[PDB]
Design a protein around this ligand. Structure first.
Ligand SMILES: O=C(CO)CO
Ligand SMILES: O=C(CO)CO
Ligand SMILES: [Tb+3]
Ligand SMILES: [Tb+3]
Lengths: 166, 166, 166, 166, 166, 166
């Protein structure tokens, strides 16, 4: 499986780095997409290499999608190409993992009405207004959509996501 | 006029400090309300004294409301008392000024359906999903609601808000 | 009115941003002059665009002058052209607003002998030794010179300065 | 399984957080031991709660040990109780995972002579002088000792360590 | 010889630490005085222990005085007791070393008229207005007063100061 | 005398700056060697200019060597040219001063077996395993090798090193 990550500067560091390594453990290939090639830096100063730009992503080449949190999703969700990648992959039923502010990208994609999941609690009202049945749980599994709230939830978030890719 | 500010740690510094001083220039009394007494610190490190807690606010004692941005609104909007203050003041037609992420508190108050305004562009989709006709302008005036987007808009934001309080 | 600001890196952020927006509210044009074009960054990390260099300033083209504080005045006061701009504008009786360390530029211009005003209290002795009757007040108005001490004084500083430009 | 972590302030954040969550995914209980109760803060600013002090650790109550890196191991290795915990657990054949500077604690425990493993390359010479057959690989498995070098190795480090605990 | 240092938070780190150690090399005793007991922290984050408060200093018990720079002198120079210590020691002809902003304390003491020395160039005009014959040199020796400008001057600053204490 | 420093980014600031100025006081020439020309930055943010790269160093052109601490030695000790400079200078009996983590470079050079000295206590075990008779003292003098532990030892470290160069 080829797993795509849509992120940008000010990503929540462990929310990117944890699934990156957890999915590599399984033998999956992992790719970081952002605005430009080079590096991006997390809220806490970890730097990661960008593999490809949003413009170069062909969603048909990727099997699954991860949406880390932090302040990066509010930047990503204004990029039509990044939102279109998330819209396509999610609506096609490919596995999509989101955490914390990550699902702001899915809100903007317009794909969450009637879906069941969670997010950082600070944006619960925005998830509800997008039509989500919002649950206060460490992980929620709604078909292809695996969602979690905060870094304390990482263990449960990927415990469930790895099952979808098997 | 007695002007109330609803804010918390990680407020956008100039979005609090600018209206605070601008309204004092007019002779209005300005009050900072937050979770606890003591001080709160902005994203950029400016410290301000808290005048009263959300619990101690009686909305009937205040004439107008200011909602600065930053990351503070995502904290404030989870406090039922703070959201109730905003709901009451806004729904009674008292002047309410919001900037950047500030109107996340108004989203949570459930008062924006059918209203027109603006915000930080990163949350435009959340404003639209709350029932706002979102306008990309430095300031929008919709009856009692004066809204702006970013720090570059400060001059226009308070130019319009000062007029409502006269 | 065309209002010139003389500043540099490590300016006290709100002491630049507050008068910048306050004077734009009135419809005045505001210009940031510094060592080079591009941007400058405040003590607290706010970035502002430089409109023109000190070398390109013709003082006859500007109606008023603002001198924010921070650590920037100790840099500005070593630039002969910046000091000459301040000397010319102040000595011609044009409105000049200073706050905090801002009047270090006026000290270096040699224009304060026999004048009355204020500054950041830490440099009161230097103001006295330059020939200033130093007053511990939130704002002092001495003809064309409007002076204040610290960020807490912003409201009173521009309340008085706006009156000189009308 | 009950997994003990020996660490301190200035731990490499992801080297603690990654195995903590990865092992919780398996249903293992995870315990952070340090100098004092309260919190410890990583090099990159993540804070974690300390479960127990080194003085309160009874090594017989834990099944496995994790030694994250950063600057914390040079502090931990001067605490004779922490070193004695590592010596006891490692010499009894319990699973021990180390990464980056983590095995400095094992050097001080005097248990690495004739063993095979890796570390941050900057301390390879110190591992060699302690009697280690040093290997430049993302993960090395030498009986109970699973060792890795840097954060890029996380995926492989816990892939192998999880196998020892099953 | 007993050497006193008058300083406070935001001292220029190397301007305190360098003379501290250089004078200990000679066998002199070194004492840090500040507003309160406990620790003070430099601009660059080095922490030093305060030996005594300004209020507890009896200038007759000390043989020489060092005035480091940074932002600390603008705080120290508003403390009547600290200024009185500097006034007494300097006017009695005891060796006094200053660097960078350090001599702002001597300006406030009122002891520099007709004296010859240097400082951080940003405050040269303030030194001149206090009656100093200001010299742009790495070190100036004017009887008991040894003055330097910036951290690059440290070697020459103490080369000359150690000669006065011999 | 021409004194070479082998260092890199994340050097302990005062451990480089202190001997640099102390040795310049004597009239010695001081040279900073690192990976590349330009500047290097300490743990605490002080920046220093690099005079030459490790590749350009001819050890026969330098009379003495200084090895500051911080995290820089773990980078320097993986550069075989830097290690070969230290090996050559130390084994030829030229004066070598080390402090804190500085002697990690000497460990890697393979020159400490049977020698007597000190270091940061956190790496004492690594010094012992390299064949050092490790002493817990502020300064140790073993022929050409002058060693100290921490920044508190600076005064004694250079007191002894200066004697070797005279
Ligand atoms: O129509 C708006 C909601 O009222 C969104 O554009
Ligand atoms: O008299 C002033 C100078 O004119 C100082 O107080
Ligand atoms: Tb051997
Ligand atoms: Tb041996």
């Amino acid at each position: 499986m080829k797993v795509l990550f849509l992120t940008a500067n000010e990503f929540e560091d462990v929310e990117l780095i944890y699934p990156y390594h957890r999915l590599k453990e399984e033998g999956h290939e992992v790719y970081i997409a952002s605005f430009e090639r080079g590096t991006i830096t997390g809220k806490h100063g970890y730097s990661v290499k960008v593999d490809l730009t949003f413009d170069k992503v062909n969603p048909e080449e990727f099997d699954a999608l991860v949406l880390p949190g932090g302040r990066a999703p509010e930047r990503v969700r204004l990029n039509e190409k990044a939102v279109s990648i998330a819209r396509k992959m999610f609506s096609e039923g490919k596995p999509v993992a989101s955490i914390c502010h990550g699902p702001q990208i899915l809100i903007s994609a317009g794909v969450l009405r009637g879906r069941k999941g969670t997010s950082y609690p600070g944006i619960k009202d925005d998830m509800i207004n997008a039509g989500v049945e919002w649950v206060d749980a460490e992980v929620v599994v709604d078909g292809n959509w695996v969602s979690s709230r905060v870094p304390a939830d990482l263990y449960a978030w990927m415990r469930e996501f790895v099952k979808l890719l098997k």
